[PDB]
Amino acid sequence: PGSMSSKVLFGNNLDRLNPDSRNTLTKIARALLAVDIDKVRLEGHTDNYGDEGYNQKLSERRAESVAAVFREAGMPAANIEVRGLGMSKPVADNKTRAGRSENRRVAIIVPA
């Protein structure tokens, strides 16, 4: 509901978006660029199931997946940073499937 309200959720232990989710992410990056948003930091996250090491690498791959979409959308490669926070920074409760759902994500951050 507006380009600034942009959530990017992933399936369980999936580090790539599906055709429809990737499509919807593309028009987000398209929308951001059209309003001069220009540079982004991408931070991937996971639920707290599995090993720390797996999740960290998983969250890295999620963020890189989103980075590849922004690059394809026409945003300069140098203007994109990628981080994985693994499971360290949940937005929702991991003890419910609805919460775990919300933690499987990449947060788009716009730096000054």
Added chain:
Amino acid sequence: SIEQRSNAVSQVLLGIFSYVRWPKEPAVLQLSVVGPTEYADGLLRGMVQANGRRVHAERRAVDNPDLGTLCNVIYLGVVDERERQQVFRSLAGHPVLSISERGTECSVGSMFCLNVGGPRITFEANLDSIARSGVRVHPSVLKLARRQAT
């Protein structure tokens, strides 16, 4: 200068507020200052938007049950991870604009994170936080951040 920096925080917040819409637009904007802050004293003295709507600010505790219903804006100071989680659990499902005084991370939590160091106050925006906030943010808000950094 604490005085210079506090007034600049006031002006940047007034700028940010001008790009935000609340689903029920209140007659007065109510702002909660939460956690240790160094630059909020300008806010705490009260502010006025260009159209005359006032911003009334009060300090409130991290563990205030009613944080989400008692304010339209929260200005978040030094909170640890458990306190931050508590705050945003309170805000969940309520239309609340969140801004943190420090921007050392901006990974989870506040929609906007100030950087109150150096020449001009800048900020980052977390679009995932904006998405869970319940308020509407016009993308031109980032012009302000862009121009302040430059």
